[PDB]
Design a protein around this ligand. Sequence first.
Ligand SMILES: Nc1ncnc2c1ncn2[C@@H]1O[C@H](CSCC[C@H](N)C(=O)O)[C@@H](O)[C@H]1O
Length: 243
Amino acid sequence: KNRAFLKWAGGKYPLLDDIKRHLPKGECLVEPFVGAGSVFLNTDFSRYILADINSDLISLYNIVKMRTDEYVQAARELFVPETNCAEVYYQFREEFNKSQDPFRRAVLFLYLNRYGYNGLCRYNLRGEFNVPFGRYKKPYFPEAELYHFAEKAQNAFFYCESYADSMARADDASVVYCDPPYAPLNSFTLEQQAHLAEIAEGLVERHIPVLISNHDTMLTREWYQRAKLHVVKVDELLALYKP
Ligand SMILES: Nc1ncnc2c1ncn2[C@@H]1O[C@H](CSCC[C@H](N)C(=O)O)[C@@H](O)[C@H]1O
């Protein structure tokens, strides 16, 4: 398995094998909620369309893809011993929330991901990144994973859009994998949870396959009723809409 250079909520690898197991074959793979990229990094599709509502995440990715070397250097500089204390963490966080330069924010973003509390990515109502210091003993600088990501991203495209817009890019050779925010065991609402299933129902009729991942609850079985369901031992459900 290829680790993702970022720390993202949930953890896709913790189910990775079973996903490749029901993931239809095809030319292009479409991930409406790319996330940390666990699925992307661990598959061999010809092309990739990766999207996410988080702008900071996509900016980062496009940069890692286009300016891999330049980045890795600037990034590496922040993982020295001189920056491993709350004192600095809150300084870099502030520099980030105030920055207007895409590149500088992409660098700080990684540092925040690694030195921040539980590697969370959260913002307050003002739109500022508001995660606290994680007090980690020795943060790991993902240099190996950055490059691997960068190399594989050469056959990928990153978009910053909602799930509906990205899934609307899938063609006959495309195959859709959806990893939306987990169901109840702004924010991703129940109304949208259903809208996604509704869209899946739509694509599958155009003969475009779609695989959805989510908890296994009364609500998920309800939304994904029109799909071959397979439980994975709260549990984990995989919904497959096969043409
Ligand atoms: N409307 C929307 N369209 C596309 N991506 C969205 C979205 N709402 C949230 N996201 C994105 O969805 C991604 C989910 S990441 C994977 C999450 C996981 N299985 C969990 O539930 O914890 C995040 O990266 C987030 O930025």
